[PDB]
Amino acid sequence: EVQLVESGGGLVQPGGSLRLSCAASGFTFSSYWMSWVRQAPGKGLEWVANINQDGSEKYYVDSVKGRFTISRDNAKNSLYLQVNSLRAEDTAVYYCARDWDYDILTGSWFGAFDIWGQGTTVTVSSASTKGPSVFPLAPSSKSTSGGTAALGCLVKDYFPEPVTVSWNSGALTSGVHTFPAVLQSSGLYSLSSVVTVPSSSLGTQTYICNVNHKPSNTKVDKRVEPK
Amino acid sequence: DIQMTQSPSSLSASVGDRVTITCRASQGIRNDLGWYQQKPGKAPKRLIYAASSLQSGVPSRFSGSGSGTEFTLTISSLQPEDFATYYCLQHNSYPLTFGGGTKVEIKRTVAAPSVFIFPPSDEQLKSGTASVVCLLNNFYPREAKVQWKVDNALQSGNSQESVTEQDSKDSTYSLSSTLTLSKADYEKHKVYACEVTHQGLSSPVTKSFNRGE
């Protein structure tokens, strides 16, 4: 029931602009301070901004000051974090979060964040959006006397995150490992998905890697075969 | 301003065991401290507020105490769900500050990794780059070493590694290492080998292949 959802996000170049909305429901919005929080990939949590109940008093972290503006529409039940002029460091995820308790109360829990949205991702970079190349990682044969084989797909050079990887549709979950993407030197993202299967299954069983990259609006199905 | 410093930065414990992460305030916070639990991609969930109070929906295994500037979050009986990074925060004064974060990991029996190596696809070579991948599968503990050798020469700066979050069921980790080279460079050399060292292995495991084999 109680839900808060971030919005906006998306990539834009540096000195760019974005208006992250945050819609809230399930509580009396007007009575609670709201807070933006960011997590750069690889980094820890950093509080962005807060706004009081009346919407007057607003606070920001130093890095952000001048750049971001925290707005509010108690009637609208929305958060609005206006972002300008974006820097690379600015790349991260943004969560809008509830304070606990009533802003009115002297005992003030408002700094405690009891509810959070899923987050929205903002990527700041010069790279253009690009669909990934998908290359098969073919399995070895007779690697061992026993028959355990590993296969997978190489999803390379796509921007920006995220990407979705599935095997045989949802059908094959078990041994699957889809590694977190790494930023390449080029500035493009690359990752690999792997699964371990019985050697006997090669040939008999069909293995298709399903890659979906929403930003580029591309979908690919590559079937991996021994060779 | 105040800085919150958690310790230890990382820990590994067995299921039922009791875990205690501490957070230290440079300045007297009073009891304006909260704790949050975060899973890899997911957004943080608030565990405790006002130092002691549990928030709704949290199990009693989680508890928080504090006096003075020093505060502790204890987990009486660690569960597998508990894998995560835990952060302390002080709401006492602005700016709000979070600690560095403590990564909790489920201690499990040692397991050696299965090792596989994959040569570049023919399709990829046309791109001009060659990507060699070496998969380390289902090993514990997380620390694993991967060295790359082309024609028995050690490589540096060419590789990138990625590690999965600990497995839900297995509580094991997996690793991928990618060696990237030019097509021209790749064609130059015959043998590509990935060598792995881990606590689980008595001897080094190396898998290799010959180009054009």
Next chain:
Amino acid sequence: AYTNSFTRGVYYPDKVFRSSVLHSTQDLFLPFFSNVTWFHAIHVSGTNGTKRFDNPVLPFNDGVYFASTEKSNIIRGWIFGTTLDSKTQSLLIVNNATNVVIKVCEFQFCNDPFLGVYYHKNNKSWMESEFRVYSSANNCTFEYVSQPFLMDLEGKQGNFKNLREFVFKNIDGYFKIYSKHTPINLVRDLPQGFSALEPLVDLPIGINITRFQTLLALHRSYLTPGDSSSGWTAGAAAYYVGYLQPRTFLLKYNENGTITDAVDCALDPLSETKCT
């Protein structure tokens, strides 16, 4: 709300310069670790909530320790006097954004005096507007005016950037004022630390003042309509008030003649030994 004024409230007892010496003196000072009343500001609009715009009248007592933190120069000034009825002479210290003005006159004050500033949308500038401290002035014994600097007109809330500490006491007719300005990064309470308050002014008013009240200002932006209905912003600022009491203190004069630390020998047994 109450906060603890750990060390603060120490001002130079006199003009005399001293060096590398510990000089004990008995003067009216804020006691160490005393209890200070905390006042808060965010003027309440028609709607109600946490919002509070507190302009109460406070007792003058022995003298008053006044401290204020300001995001946006909300607090314009103070009033000192017994009645503030316009029955007799009273002190009005206000910064009309342009200059500090001091007037002794027998002013008539409104029930709730305050300042407001308004900002027109057409021009983007914050200028003062509503001002209702006094109806009229009676005879005036003395008048003073000061520098042209400007003050923060808008209601901006955030970490309190600055700290202004004042001590007001009138001994023998003399209204003595001490002050100190420092930057600070702390919203909640007074920072823990020691600093002196040098004397700015000594006025010969010689009037008996029983009570005092603080004045705050309103801040209106361009967006707001000028009217008094609900277009006004008090700002983030808060102030604290404590009361001085005759106590003995040990003042430590550095080589410079600035006072690094002090001991409140009244405070604790350890302290009591220090004076001896």
